[PDB]
RNA sequence: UGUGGACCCGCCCCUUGGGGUGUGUCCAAAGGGCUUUGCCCGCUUCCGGAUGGGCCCGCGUCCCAUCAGCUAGUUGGUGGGGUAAUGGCCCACCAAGGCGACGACGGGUAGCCGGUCUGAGAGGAUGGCCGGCCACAGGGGCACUGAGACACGGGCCCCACUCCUACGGGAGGCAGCAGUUAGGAAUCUUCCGCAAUGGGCGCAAGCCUGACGGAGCGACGCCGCUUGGAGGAAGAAGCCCUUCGGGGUGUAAACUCCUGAACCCGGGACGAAACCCCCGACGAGGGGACUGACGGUACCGGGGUAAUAGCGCCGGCCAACUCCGUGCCAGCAGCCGCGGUAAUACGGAGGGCGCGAGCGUUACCCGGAUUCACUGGGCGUAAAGGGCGUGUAGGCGGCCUGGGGCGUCCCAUGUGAAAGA
RNA sequence: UUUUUU
RNA sequence: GGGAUUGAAAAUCCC
């Protein structure tokens, strides 16, 4: 018995906690941004959106989201905050988005 | 090549979708007479353009739904309901031959 | 209605020769005419000619037979021993140029209908085409 | 039948039924004897034919024929079944292999020894 | 990674190899991309090695990796000679 | 292991002299002299009109026994001729004639077929310089069939070649008698064989 | 730090989410080694290539109609979630749809193919070994890590079973190679080896590899080969038959000569050349060195002994016949049939036929079988015309001309893997 | 009554 | 298990 391929499993549970953590931030930031887009705060929503995006691409850097998955979440996020900003638009910061 | 078939729309009753009946002629692999088989495709109609009895080309397409892999290329012949009448009658005989 | 006019003509001829009739009439159709042209050209009949029977057009096929023979059954040998319709309706027979048979190891013909006209098996082979196998004659 | 008919219905392959349910379609099957009997034959002949009811490893109780001049086959003896009907005895569809587990070959059998399962003797 | 190697097609005690382009992950006697040579190691015939250099050079421009022995036999047939 | 036993009995059972005994199938002892009837107790009895199968059977045996071959190699050679281009009938004969043992006999190296078989088996035969000990080896045209110089001094070889002096050889063969050489020039034709055998009957024995 | 890439939006060209562009936002990294000033193994972002793969579609793919109706995410839509990616894949809401006699639904059976077997072919049968695809890893579900798995020798949970147990709780998973047991008519060695080929890791040296290369067992198949060759009596003995004259076994044995399977002796491999070292720049090129399981086996040379034969069959089909024993007995038998006192059919013998390290038997597949008839059958009396009509679907369609070119026919081309043929 | 028309 | 009986066997008859 006792293969030391078991080492692999020990590392699995390491990376599981790495991946799982960054995603949880992503979601918790993404929602946050949208919550202010719906609530018409433009500057704060865009400020948070830039941090969301940064966290997304940073998770693409490694083995969490590596593919165009990160680009998926970005796309959906920018669409949602722009459209939610369409209610009394006033895009104050205008940082994250294009003119 | 994307496969392209020509058939007759026998169903209007969906939304953005039409059923196309496509005949097919081929010699029997053993007995050799020419036999006529036919298949129904669910084709995508985004503009609700095509109506019942129309004879339409249908093109192999990116999957739209379960059971929808074709889109309506163009209109060949407008509204010959004799085809639809053959299909409807044949459907109607099945109410007999049960009990 | 006449179901298969060609089988009908083939048969009018078959029966006609079985009683050694001089001639026999078959209802006129261009395709039939083009068949009789091959029968004539290949020496199976004396010939044919257009005619009007009671106002309607027909083809008088003049058949030929061999010599009156010796002791009992003097009846001549036949020139058309065997005529058979091959591709009938409800079971159609088309042959590619490599599917074209050799009829009676050479001594008969297979009338094809080709996109290039009604040919014999030899004509249609050397022409490099196939088509609907109409009938054996030999 | 018309071509349309053969198109619509088509021919029907003749399913062939087995003449020997020695199951698993096996070439032979071992079983234990139930009885060892002598049965009277069909009309044109008459004799005493020694047969045996066998419980088979396939789950079958069937009659088998005991070939040769004389046998040692007893009530509880085990034997192997070969297949092949005995014509002039209805019901017997399988033969018995002689020269198998509890079934002695034929003694003093000098002509057809492959059948009847007997060895090759010595000549001084 | 695509590889250039040998595939044994002789019989027992009679090996004959087929210099072959295949995915490293397939069996050695399994499905390959292209047969680009044969190798007879007992040298039973006058011609016991053939290569078709200019095809090997193709598969090397795209990064097939030859075995040590495949490279031995390729070099011998002059695949790498650049003069 | 081929047929090994009394042979001049098959001389009788076929009804034709079979020279498998070599000599003494020539001297009036062959038992085909003053005993042409088949062997056994019922040999001198009046034989019944054979069945059509019986005829093709006795013709095939008549040929098979002549070449001294098992049924196995016999039929495999036949099917080989059935596949090859040309007349099955004569192709088969050319193939049987191409057996190294048969060539050896045919070159007058051995008195008989059987003797030729033993001579091959013991490696006394050269083919293009090489020893060949298989009686079944197919000789090709242009092959030099020699005698191993090891055995050239043996008294059986000098014995047979002594009587081969001035003896004529088959038109598809030629031999040098001093150097104990020989050559297979070409395949024999039907007319090149005097075989008292109807090939068509044999072909017709294998149609069944 | 911004070569560049990603996202929103706009514009251009394309046309399904393809390419370019602008502003804005977001995103890079790692070191190690020596012959330590330069080079080798690595690292980051991007484009392309090559290879492997996902998903989608047309067509083909066994039996039962004594299975005729099936369907609730079920069919479609809008939006959303998810994924590398389309998609009722999932979710909410809306519409009421979708499938079926061209066989839906249900039941039975089953991995599919390249092929293989048979057959004149058309066809039938089959899918072992080998190659390609799939599925599964005690049964069921599940996700994690990752380019890739929902993972045989990884993880969690439920179930059944074996083992440990301080009764609280734990450990397992040969459908990997051998091997054991069970079942079964029946299926192998707990073998050698890293020398070759191939794979993983490594700058390399090298390590692992029951992949593999070999050996072992089994007439299981195929193939080659031996049990002698030549002389030898109008013909021994024994056996068998007989008209008692004789006939047969039979040139067969003896016996004469010749060769020399086994076995002994010596030599003794190919499969092996690269990796590596050195010159040359760690390139081309040149040079050089180590490297065996099989195995002292194959093979060669020398010496050399007459040195296993069996099994079926002999009434017709079917090639081979007499004697005696037995008397509807004992028994033979594929079918037709043999035996109730002369049996070429039972049993033995002599003899003969057929094959021969085999020969027979059983099972199964095709053939003969044109006996499911496309090729290639039929229905007055042989099995078969519906008791009759009307008519639905379907099948089929007179003569002339013209368009089209769907079937049909021709040319080119891509494909049709390797093996097999 | 049963087998064997010889 | 024997004789009559039948080509033989059944049946029938005799110790
Ligand atoms: Mg590790
Ligand atoms: Mg939270
Ligand atoms: Mg992942
Ligand atoms: Mg609609
Ligand atoms: Mg949709
Ligand atoms: Mg309904
Ligand atoms: Mg039925
Ligand atoms: Mg006992
Ligand atoms: Mg692979
Ligand atoms: Mg060169
Ligand atoms: Mg031939
Ligand atoms: Mg010649
Ligand atoms: Mg044949
Ligand atoms: Mg830039
Ligand atoms: Mg920019
Ligand atoms: Mg940065
Ligand atoms: Mg750092
Ligand atoms: Mg691809
Ligand atoms: Mg959607
Ligand atoms: Mg994934
Ligand atoms: Mg729902
Ligand atoms: Mg359909
Ligand atoms: Mg199954
Ligand atoms: Mg064949
Ligand atoms: Mg046939
Ligand atoms: Mg199958
Ligand atoms: Mg199949
Ligand atoms: Mg297996
Ligand atoms: Mg499972
Ligand atoms: Mg499981
Ligand atoms: Mg990985
Ligand atoms: Mg698992
Ligand atoms: Mg799996
Ligand atoms: Mg395991
Ligand atoms: Mg307890
Ligand atoms: Mg057991
Ligand atoms: Mg083995
Ligand atoms: Mg050892
Ligand atoms: Mg290795
Ligand atoms: Mg290696
Ligand atoms: Mg490396
Ligand atoms: Mg290990
Ligand atoms: Mg192996
Ligand atoms: Mg055995
Ligand atoms: Mg002798
Ligand atoms: Mg000597
Ligand atoms: Mg070597
Ligand atoms: Mg070497
Ligand atoms: Mg240097
Ligand atoms: Mg070099
Ligand atoms: Mg090495
Ligand atoms: Mg050694
Ligand atoms: Mg020697
Ligand atoms: Mg000697
Ligand atoms: Mg001897
Ligand atoms: Mg036979
Ligand atoms: Mg006979
Ligand atoms: Mg018998
Ligand atoms: Mg007597
Ligand atoms: Mg008697
Ligand atoms: Mg009698
Ligand atoms: Mg007898
Ligand atoms: Mg018999
Ligand atoms: Mg007998
Ligand atoms: Mg005997
Ligand atoms: Mg053999
Ligand atoms: Mg056998
Ligand atoms: Mg059969
Ligand atoms: Mg048939
Ligand atoms: Mg029948
Ligand atoms: Mg039948
Ligand atoms: Mg018919
Ligand atoms: Mg019939
Ligand atoms: Mg009647
Ligand atoms: Mg009737
Ligand atoms: Mg009636
Ligand atoms: Mg009736
Ligand atoms: Mg018409
Ligand atoms: Mg019509
Ligand atoms: Mg026209
Ligand atoms: Mg066209
Ligand atoms: Mg082509
Ligand atoms: Mg091929
Ligand atoms: Mg009787
Ligand atoms: Mg009397
Ligand atoms: Zn003789």
């Amino acid at each position: 018995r006792n293969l030391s391929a078991l080492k692999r499993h020990r590392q699995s549970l390491k990376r599981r906690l790495r991946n799982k953590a960054k995603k949880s931030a992503i979601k918790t930031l993404s929602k946050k941004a949208i919550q202010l887009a719906q609530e018409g705060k433009a500057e704060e929503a865009l400020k948070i959106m830039r941090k969301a995006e940064s966290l997304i691409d940073k998770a693409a850097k490694g083995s969490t989201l590596h593919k165009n998955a990160a680009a998926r979440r970005k796309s959906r996020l920018m669409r949602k905050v722009r459209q939610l900003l369409e209610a009394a638009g006033a895009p104050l910061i205008g940082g994250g988005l294009s003119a | 090549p994307k496969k392209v078939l020509t058939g007759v729309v026998v169903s209007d009753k969906m939304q953005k979708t039409v059923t196309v009946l496509v005949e097919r002629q081929f010699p029997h692999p053993l007995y050799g007479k020419v036999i006529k088989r036919s298949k129904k495709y669910l084709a995508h109609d985004p503009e609700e353009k095509y109506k019942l009895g129309d004879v339409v080309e249908i093109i192999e397409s990116r999957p739209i739904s379960k059971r929808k892999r074709f889109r309506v290329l163009r209109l060949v012949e407008s509204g010959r309901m004799d085809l639809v009448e053959k299909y409807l009658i044949r459907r109607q005989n099945y109410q007999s031959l049960s009990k | 209605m006449l179901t298969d006019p060609i089988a009908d003509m083939l048969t009018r001829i078959r029966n006609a020769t079985r009683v050694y009739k001089e001639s026999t009439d078959v209802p006129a159709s261009r395709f039939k005419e083009e068949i009789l042209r091959i029968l004539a050209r290949e020496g199976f009949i004396k010939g044919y000619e257009r005619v009007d029977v009671d106002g309607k057009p027909y083809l008088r096929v003049y058949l030929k037979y061999g010599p009156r023979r010796q002791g009992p059954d003097p009846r001549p040998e036949q020139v058309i021993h065997h005529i058979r319709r091959i591709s009938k309706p409800g079971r159609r027979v088309y042959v590619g140029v490599k599917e074209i048979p050799r009829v009676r190891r050479g001594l008969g013909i297979a009338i094809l209908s080709t996109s290039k006209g009604v040919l014999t098996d030899r004509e249609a082979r050397k022409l490099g085409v196939g088509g609907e196998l109409i009938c054996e004659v030999w | 039948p018309t071509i349309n008919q053969l198109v619509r219905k088509g021919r029907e392959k003749v399913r062939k039924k087995s003449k020997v349910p020695a199951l698993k379609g096996a070439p032979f099957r071992r079983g234990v004897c139930t009885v060892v009997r002598t049965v009277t034959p069909k009309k044109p002949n008459s004799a005493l034919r020694k047969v045996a009811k066998v419980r088979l490893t396939s789950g079958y109780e069937v009659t088998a024929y005991i070939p040769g001049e004389g046998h040692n086959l007893q009530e509880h003896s085990v034997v192997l079944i070969r297949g092949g009907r005995v014509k002039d005895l209805p019901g017997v569809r399988y033969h018995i292999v002689r020269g198998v587990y509890d079934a002695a070959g034929v003694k003093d059998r000098k002509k057809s020894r492959s059948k009847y399962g007997t060895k090759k003797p010595k000549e001084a | 990674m695509v590889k250039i190697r040998l595939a044994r097609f002789g019989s027992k005690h009679n090996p004959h190899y087929r210099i072959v382009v295949t995915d490293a992950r397939r069996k050695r006697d399994g499905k390959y991309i292209e047969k680009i040579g044969y190798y007879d190691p007992r040298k039973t015939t006058p011609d016991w090695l053939k290569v078709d250099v200019e095809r090997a050079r193709y598969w090397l421009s795209v990064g097939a990796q030859p075995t040590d022995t495949a490279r031995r036999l390729l070099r011998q047939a002059g695949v790498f000679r650049q003069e | 292991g081929r047929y090994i036993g009394p042979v001049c009995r098959l001389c009788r059972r076929e009804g034709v002299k079979l020279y498998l005994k070599g000599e003494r199938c020539y001297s009036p002892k062959c038992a085909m002299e003053r005993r042409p009837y088949p062997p056994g107790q019922h040999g001198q009895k009046r034989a019944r009109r054979p069945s059509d199968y019986a005829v093709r059977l006795r013709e095939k045996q008549k040929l098979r026994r002549i070449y001294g071959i098992s049924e196995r190699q016999f039929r495999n050679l036949f099917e080989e001729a059935s596949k090859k281009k040309g007349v099955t009938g004569s192709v088969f004969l050319g193939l049987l004639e191409s057996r190294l043992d048969n060539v050896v006999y045919r070159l007058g190296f051995a008195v008989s077929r059987r003797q030729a078989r033993q001579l091959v088996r013991h490696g006394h035969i050269t083919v293009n310089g090489r020893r060949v000990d298989l009686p079944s080896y197919r000789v090709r045209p242009g092959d030099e069939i020699a005698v191993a110089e090891k055995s050239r001094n043996l008294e059986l070889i000098r014995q047979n070649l002594e009587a081969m002096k001035g003896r004529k050889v088959g038109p598809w063969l030629s031999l040098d008698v001093e150097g104990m050489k020989g050559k297979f020039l070409r395949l024999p034709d039907r007319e090149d064989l005097a075989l008292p055998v109807n090939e068509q009957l044999v072909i017709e024995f294998y149609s069944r």
Side-chain angles (χ1 to χ4, degrees):
Chain A
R1 285 174 303 162
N2 222 257
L3 287 324
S4 297
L6 284 158
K7 184 171 190 162
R8 270 297 180 173
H9 181 237
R10 286 196 268 101
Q11 305 182 4
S12 184
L13 313 183
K14 282 205 157 171
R15 285 151 180 282
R16 181 176 175 282
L17 266 72
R18 204 116 45 198
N19 295 0
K20 173 171 191 295
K22 305 187 173 162
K23 284 177 157 97
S24 287
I26 302 277
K27 305 169 180 167
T28 314
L29 284 204
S30 307
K31 290 158 183 168
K32 195 175 185 189
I34 304 165
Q35 267 281 34
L36 318 176
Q38 189 184 48
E39 287 171 42
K41 294 93 166 191
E43 156 156 19
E44 321 179 47
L46 277 248
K47 196 188 181 73
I48 286 171
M49 179 204 252
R50 273 103 117 259
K51 267 203 172 168
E53 173 174 40
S54 182
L55 228 284
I56 292 183
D57 293 335
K58 283 174 174 174
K61 213 74 262 175
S63 68
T64 290
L65 298 193
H66 233 337
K67 315 282 182 192
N68 32 315
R72 268 206 343 256
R73 288 165 199 270
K74 291 168 73 179
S75 184
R76 288 185 172 108
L77 207 260
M78 304 196 111
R79 292 155 54 203
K80 286 189 272 185
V81 173
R82 187 178 283 266
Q83 297 166 19
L84 263 312
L85 250 308
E86 228 69 349
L92 296 174
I93 276 198
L97 305 169
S98 288
Chain B
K2 299 191 153 74
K3 164 74 81 177
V4 180
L5 311 156
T6 312
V8 46
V9 156
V10 301
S11 176
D12 236 332
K13 302 172 186 169
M14 259 165 308
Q15 309 184 338
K16 288 193 173 111
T17 304
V18 298
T19 315
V20 197
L21 168 56
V22 203
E23 300 207 340
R24 169 167 73 103
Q25 258 180 15
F26 70 103
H28 184 290
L30 181 47
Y31 297 145
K33 82 132 78 193
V34 196
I35 53 196
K36 182 194 302 178
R37 290 296 139 91
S38 48
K39 185 170 155 176
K40 271 185 296 178
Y41 297 79
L42 289 174
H44 181 45
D45 181 18
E47 309 181 311
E48 292 274 17
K49 259 174 81 175
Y50 306 83
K51 288 189 174 179
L52 248 148
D54 294 337
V55 168
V56 298
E57 285 176 335
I58 234 62
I59 182 212
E60 205 193 297
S61 311
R62 175 243 284 183
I64 300 99
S65 61
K66 188 190 213 166
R67 282 214 73 205
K68 285 186 76 175
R69 271 80 172 131
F70 284 74
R71 295 172 304 166
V72 181
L73 197 57
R74 47 175 212 91
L75 219 168
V76 172
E77 164 146 67
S78 176
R80 39 186 296 101
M81 298 283 297
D82 52 336
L83 308 189
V84 183
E85 278 269 340
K86 289 255 167 179
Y87 169 76
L88 287 176
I89 295 179
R90 179 198 236 82
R91 170 188 278 189
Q92 200 170 2
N93 287 334
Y94 297 157
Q95 296 181 351
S96 75
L97 40 82
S98 53
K99 281 309 187 192
Chain C
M1 186 195 302
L2 237 179
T3 149
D4 171 5
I6 296 298
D8 173 69
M9 172 187 81
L10 297 180
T11 292
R12 286 195 199 245
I13 295 165
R14 213 186 294 113
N15 299 356
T17 63
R18 285 310 170 270
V19 301
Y20 296 110
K21 291 267 178 162
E22 183 176 7
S23 120
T24 181
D25 311 8
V26 34
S29 82
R30 271 202 169 274
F31 185 39
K32 284 184 195 188
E33 209 167 320
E34 266 296 280
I35 309 297
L36 311 188
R37 162 171 277 204
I38 269 75
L39 296 179
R41 196 194 311 121
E42 285 287 343
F44 277 107
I45 44 181
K46 287 216 185 78
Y48 78 100
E49 67 178 307
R50 298 157 153 175
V51 82
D52 275 15
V53 180
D54 209 330
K56 311 311 196 325
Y58 290 77
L59 309 181
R60 290 259 171 82
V61 185
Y62 297 95
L63 327 313
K64 50 191 295 187
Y65 317 103
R68 182 182 182 284
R69 287 185 308 176
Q70 282 301 75
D73 194 3
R75 294 182 303 176
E77 190 197 357
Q78 282 283 349
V79 180
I80 303 183
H81 317 73
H82 176 268
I83 257 200
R84 187 149 71 90
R85 217 273 146 73
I86 282 175
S87 187
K88 358 182 190 59
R91 196 235 215 281
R92 238 80 195 203
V93 186
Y94 315 93
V95 287
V97 74
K98 311 92 146 295
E99 311 190 36
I100 297 166
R102 45 174 170 184
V103 172
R104 265 284 168 279
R105 199 55 75 107
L107 319 186
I109 66 164
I111 301 183
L112 297 196
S113 181
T114 68
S115 32
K116 286 191 181 168
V118 185
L119 316 177
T120 64
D121 60 329
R122 253 187 174 85
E123 294 174 15
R125 211 169 299 105
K126 98 176 176 182
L127 253 283
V129 297
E132 186 169 326
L133 223 184
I134 308 180
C135 58
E136 289 172 355
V137 195
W138 69 260
Chain D
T2 59
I3 283 307
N4 208 58
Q5 284 195 272
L6 297 151
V7 161
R8 291 193 312 114
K9 307 194 176 185
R11 296 295 175 180
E12 190 187 48
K13 298 188 198 293
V14 258
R15 299 99 170 185
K16 46 103 73 253
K17 298 277 164 60
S18 177
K19 297 204 171 297
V20 161
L23 204 68
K24 331 293 180 183
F28 308 101
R29 221 120 242 274
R30 78 169 147 95
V32 197
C33 293
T34 303
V35 223
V36 178
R37 253 192 56 86
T38 35
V39 184
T40 110
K42 281 174 70 71
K43 306 179 182 177
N45 290 330
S46 168
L48 291 162
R49 266 62 179 283
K50 294 83 205 170
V51 303
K53 316 270 187 182
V54 190
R55 214 119 309 190
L56 277 308
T57 50
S58 70
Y60 279 171
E61 312 94 330
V62 304
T63 334
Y65 182 86
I66 304 177
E69 300 261 38
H71 67 80
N72 67 314
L73 279 191
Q74 301 189 6
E75 203 244 81
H76 266 156
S77 46
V78 305
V79 77
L80 190 71
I81 267 193
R82 152 155 77 85
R85 309 208 159 196
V86 176
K87 155 84 176 178
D88 82 323
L89 307 178
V92 215
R93 298 139 111 251
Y94 323 88
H95 266 79
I96 267 171
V97 166
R98 303 211 51 163
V100 87
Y101 317 109
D102 287 2
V106 192
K107 296 169 58 178
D108 299 303
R109 232 288 185 184
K110 301 166 86 176
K111 274 282 189 172
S112 318
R113 303 200 326 281
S114 306
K115 321 172 185 179
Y116 315 132
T118 91
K119 291 288 190 176
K120 176 63 171 297
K122 274 68 54 191
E123 302 179 28
Chain E
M1 145 204 70
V2 33
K3 285 198 64 184
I4 285 185
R5 64 192 195 198
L6 279 63
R8 192 186 196 278
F9 272 128
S11 67
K12 188 192 286 158
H13 289 315
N14 175 19
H16 285 259
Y17 302 94
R18 281 198 201 177
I19 307 165
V20 129
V21 186
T22 177
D23 188 352
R25 307 178 268 186
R26 279 215 189 274
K27 332 174 164 60
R28 84 159 147 75
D29 292 6
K31 184 169 159 205
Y32 52 91
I33 313 172
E34 185 164 1
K35 169 229 178 173
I36 55 166
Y38 44 101
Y39 176 63
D40 171 22
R42 21 224 267 98
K43 322 164 205 93
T44 47
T45 42
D47 169 69
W48 46 268
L49 182 51
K50 198 199 78 172
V51 155
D52 192 295
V53 280
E54 75 112 353
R55 254 276 117 171
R57 304 186 156 180
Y58 167 71
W59 283 110
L60 298 187
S61 60
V62 255
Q65 216 58 35
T67 319
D68 296 14
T69 308
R71 182 186 278 94
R72 169 204 159 198
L73 303 175
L74 286 169
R75 174 181 323 278
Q76 188 149 5
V79 186
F80 306 78
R81 205 146 196 165
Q82 44 200 208
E83 39 232 286
Chain F
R2 302 309 144 94
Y3 173 72
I4 295 175
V7 182
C8 263
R9 87 188 306 276
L10 315 170
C11 276
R12 305 210 283 153
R13 183 47 98 170
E14 293 319 288
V16 191
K17 303 188 59 176
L18 301 192
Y19 293 152
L20 294 137
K21 252 295 189 173
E23 201 191 0
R24 185 194 216 259
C25 273
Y26 296 113
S27 72
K29 312 180 163 80
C30 170
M32 274 306 283
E33 232 72 0
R34 272 68 212 276
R35 230 149 152 266
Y37 55 88
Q41 166 181 333
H42 321 271
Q44 293 189 358
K45 299 186 177 186
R46 170 229 160 202
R48 233 123 308 193
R49 193 276 286 174
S51 47
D52 286 23
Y53 170 85
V55 194
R56 293 145 173 78
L57 191 269
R58 306 313 312 183
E59 205 74 359
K60 180 200 74 78
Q61 295 301 83
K62 178 150 60 75
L63 199 270
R64 166 160 166 255
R65 307 245 185 82
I66 267 179
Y67 279 88
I69 300 179
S70 79
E71 189 59 78
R72 252 292 189 193
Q73 301 187 327
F74 200 77
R75 181 124 183 257
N76 300 329
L77 271 146
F78 177 92
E79 302 288 315
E80 207 181 48
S82 297
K83 297 187 176 191
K84 291 179 74 72
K85 308 289 178 181
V87 173
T88 322
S90 63
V91 166
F92 196 26
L93 286 188
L95 268 47
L96 301 163
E97 265 302 315
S98 274
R99 281 183 67 80
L100 180 58
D101 52 23
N102 166 268
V103 176
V104 167
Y105 165 80
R106 277 283 200 247
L107 279 172
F109 286 147
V111 186
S112 58
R113 295 270 156 75
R114 318 166 126 285
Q115 185 179 104
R117 175 177 185 82
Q118 177 158 96
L119 288 175
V120 174
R121 236 295 97 170
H122 292 149
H124 296 291
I125 274 67
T126 280
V127 174
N128 297 98
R130 266 68 192 101
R131 173 168 65 253
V132 174
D133 56 21
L134 311 129
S136 48
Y137 176 97
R138 179 161 295 151
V139 192
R140 305 152 137 169
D143 289 355
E144 258 221 351
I145 301 88
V147 182
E149 357 77 70
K150 271 70 183 172
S151 327
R152 275 210 282 262
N153 314 280
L154 228 177
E155 35 187 336
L156 217 167
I157 311 189
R158 202 165 303 193
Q159 239 309 312
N160 305 339
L161 292 194
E162 217 66 278
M164 284 297 313
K165 282 183 174 184
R167 263 197 172 197
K168 295 191 172 189
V169 78
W172 70 102
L173 291 191
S174 80
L175 83 168
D176 162 279
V177 196
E178 29 269 308
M180 316 205 185
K181 281 195 162 185
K183 217 177 303 171
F184 192 95
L185 323 178
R186 255 301 299 155
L187 290 194
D189 199 339
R190 161 79 276 198
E191 291 67 59
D192 287 40
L193 283 331
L195 289 196
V197 173
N198 187 1
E199 50 267 8
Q200 291 288 280
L201 292 207
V202 182
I203 295 181
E204 291 175 349
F205 176 75
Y206 291 115
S207 300
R208 154 190 293 265

